[model samples]
Target: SNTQTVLPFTGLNTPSGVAVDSAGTVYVTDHGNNRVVKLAAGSNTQTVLPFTGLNTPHGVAVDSAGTVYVTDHGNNRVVKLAAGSNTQTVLPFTGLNTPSGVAVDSAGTVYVTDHGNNRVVKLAAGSNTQTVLPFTGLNTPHGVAVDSAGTVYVTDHGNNRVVKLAAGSNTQTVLPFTGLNTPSGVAVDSAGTVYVTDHGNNRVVKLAAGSNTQTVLPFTGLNTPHGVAVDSAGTVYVTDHGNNRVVKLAA
Candidate 1:
């Protein structure tokens, strides 16, 4: 319980996404402010990234090369900012309807949840082409994540479940689930465990590799929480959206 630290001043406006790089620096999307912020490791000062073109930014993720990907919901596009730079170039692609979550896999493949369209789309790393994965028929999907093995995990917000699309062409709609209240945020660990944000219930739930059981973590004092992520050290980071803040839960 003592392994928690509330971030600096309540300056974040509608904070939605939380991510930490390998070096421990945290990046968050100030959605209401139309910009992304960079927080240096071992500091409390909130220094906002130099950008004002984000369109209702919702989900944020950083790949291995330090490339930062953000879903510009208002404009219906995804903008990418290269490492050590602030200039953003819009990823050229189409067929997105209200994209909310963005995540990159081990191969630098980008995955997005087209919430309004009820499906998750993939963007190849080098080629950068959009292809709707064979897995479909989701109910307003939101958050999405990929594991080391390239398996995909998505949050079917409308159906109150988290579904997985196993890597390779032999994918299926596996893991029909119902253990949380509107679980919209998801991330998988090295052990294949899924961490989700029970957005409607103000709690976080964890599901084992191949089980329907739900283990609620002790961090239940959240408010409208969303966009969860786990770092290399197994530390959990989530946005307490309703409170305009982010909390770093020690691993």
Candidate 2:
């Protein structure tokens, strides 16, 4: 089929996060809608998660098992919903405050940004136990991602920088501190290069793997960029919060 398919799904208000599963099913967190909606692979419309009790859902991530984890910003906790099921709740509520970003690692451990708390937290995927990364220099840490090697990267929104946390360590700092303005969302490509969305600058910046150098995307235009994601093929997707649209960039 040479024709391009465009699907228009409705029932979302202030959609904040979007993730695609291995099977290509799309999951979106409707912050204002206070729920998560799933679009079946190859379909245009979506079906809301059957569970209730989410408060201002903001970020969502899916694990290898297809389990979905969402940060309930208004409730200051993360909730998990099993694949093909609606069960959900507070799984590791300790040390979380206004959590707005979440990412699941290869080991099923979940990393979440404690927005109000100004730090990041790690919780056992299926359990309630957790550990807080004592980041001393972060300011309004918002978006988070865990690379395949288990290293963590977080966007320090208040400080206008991206910080990297070595695996199993509390030590962290602003990497590539130059040329970022209110960086909000972050994503790492399969090659380990980092991509950050600079909200204040209205652009996305790419940090080459193992280097401090960077490249700005759509350098001419962007509007309050927020979330970012990388596909297997290295294509980057960014959500322009101010413009209410999503854009894709070649890696």
Candidate 3:
């Protein structure tokens, strides 16, 4: 069963990230455009936020409430926009150095990757204070995601591996890092399967929860795959940076 579809790019330049909400609405970070564009579910597309104050927006993630969290890479901060409200700085000047990816957990806590700082920082749902992951060894953390069990998976770009941090634990290390090459983004599915984008290797690798066995997808066609997100139905969406498009793959 072929489950690949290339969505229109909406004339975006250097599109960096893509995310979907509970309702299936799609959002893309037009990095060079410096804004986030929303496309309504089941429709060709539409601009939900146009020309909003953004700087090198790199990653986007939506919460259960439909609220959107975006990382302003150039500004070194993350911003939250309510379901229908305007953009507001949620972690403005939190001392993040070159934030790259942002994801929200079930409890509303936000996890952001500080690419320049080489760590993942957490922000309470509605609080202004931030907590950096206690892990001691990280090399240019780029993307992050939390599983249903609260375990956080972070992609260390420079280290060429992904690390799994148990809930409330600090120690972390290369998770099934045997085959990864510049792993950039990670997404955990409802079934607990972890999918990572191997940017340097140009493919998407999947690992069964708690196991190191992997299955790589479309190894020959992908080009600089970056971010990945999985839907409840077991569908996987990935941003192909080198291809300048998003591709869908079935589980």
lDDT by residue for model 3 (167-224), tens? 8885775677567778888888787788889886788888886666788865347888
Model 1 lDDT, residue 141, Cα = 85
Better of 2 and 3 by lDDT: 3
Ranking by lDDT: 1, 3, 2
Please tell me which model should have the higher TM-score, number 1 or number 3: 3
Stretches of candidate 3 above 4 Å error?
A: 48-51
lDDT of 1 by residue, 1-251 (tens): 44767766357888888777788778888888888887778886767665547778888998877788898888888888887676887886587888999999878888888888887888887666788876666888889999988888888888787778777865566564455788878888888878898887888777777665767777747899987888788888888888888887766
Model 3, TM vs. native: 0.93
Report lDDT per candidate.
Answer: 0.80, 0.75, 0.79
Worst 10 residues of 1 by lDDT: 170-179
Give a tens-digit lDDT track for model 2, residues 1-251.
Answer: 11212224464555677666676666677677787877766676678886568888888887767788888888888888888775675676586778888999888888899898887889875576788877777788888998988889998888877888888676775776567768877888778789888877888788887766788765345677677776676656666556545455655
TM-score of each: 0.93, 0.88, 0.93
Query: Which regions of candidate 2 are displaced past 4 Å?
Result: 1-7, 219-221
Error of 2 at 77 (Å): 1.3
